[PDB]
Homo-oligomer: A and B are copies of this chain.
């Protein structure tokens, strides 16, 4: 089978949006989009789920040492070889107010991740090739009813509206494929951040189409 690694944040993990913000649980394996992707691709594909809630592209979060995507991705790639394609959907967490990042800064973080994929051939001690990479801008954020989410994401809705543009430009320069998740879904979870069951279905179906076309 061809092997597809989905690297991302809570949107990849499958965070169930709740009115009280947190804590929550994971969408069922056949409901979260990575599962819908697996189902739509079929049994000659294997999907590997590497979504970590709150993960950023390449910035340390002072509240939690686990969340720097670029710190983890090289080790993850070498763990999962052989791989055919890595889907990277990140950037939503980088738009939190405390990071004070512009859309460019976020695209630069994404560029680091893209380069990690492109330079991954061989892993540790193998003959395996580098996978391809698909850069995915997350859908724009929506208004958030929970006061804490409103606070931590101040300015974030605005910055997420620019990610499709800056990620498309980056992908074009780096000669790697791009897909805008916002082109097929809006962020419809009750919290303004996460995905509904239908959001997950629609993105999984859309990404299966992208994956088939790329391989």
Whole-angstrom distance between the alpha carbons of A21 and B173 in the complex? 6
Whole-angstrom distance between the alpha carbons of A122 and B64 in the complex? 13
Chain A 127-167 per-residue mask, 1 if CB under 8 angstroms from chain B, else 0: 11000000000000000001111111010000000000110
**Residues A35-55 near B (CB distance < 8 A):** 46, 49-54
Listed stretches A71-79, A181-189, A200-208; interface member: A71-79
Query: Is there a chain B Cβ closer than 8 Å to A10's Cβ?
Result: yes
- Interface pair B25/A127, CB less than 8 Å apart: yes
Tell me the count of chain A residues lying within 8 A, CB to CB, of chain B. 70
**Residues A42-96 near B (CB distance < 8 A):** 46, 49-54, 58, 62-67, 71-72, 74-75, 78-82
Query: Is there a chain B Cβ closer than 8 Å to A212's Cβ?
Result: no
Say what secondary structure dominates the interface of chain A: mixed
Query: Is there a chain B Cβ closer than 8 Å to A126's Cβ?
Result: yes
- Interface pair B127/A146, CB less than 8 Å apart: no
Query: A169 — which chain B residues lie within 8 A by C-beta?
Result: 146-148, 150-151
- Interface pair B72/A23, CB less than 8 Å apart: no
Q: Which 8 A-B pairs have the closest CB atoms?
A: A148-B173, A53-B124, A147-B169, A66-B75, A22-B125, A148-B169, A21-B173, A52-B79
A-B contacts, 17 listed (Cβ < 8 Å): A1-B29, A21-B172, A22-B173, A24-B126, A26-B126, A29-B46, A53-B78, A53-B126, A63-B115, A67-B124, A72-B75, A97-B104, A98-B105, A98-B108, A104-B152, A107-B151, A147-B165
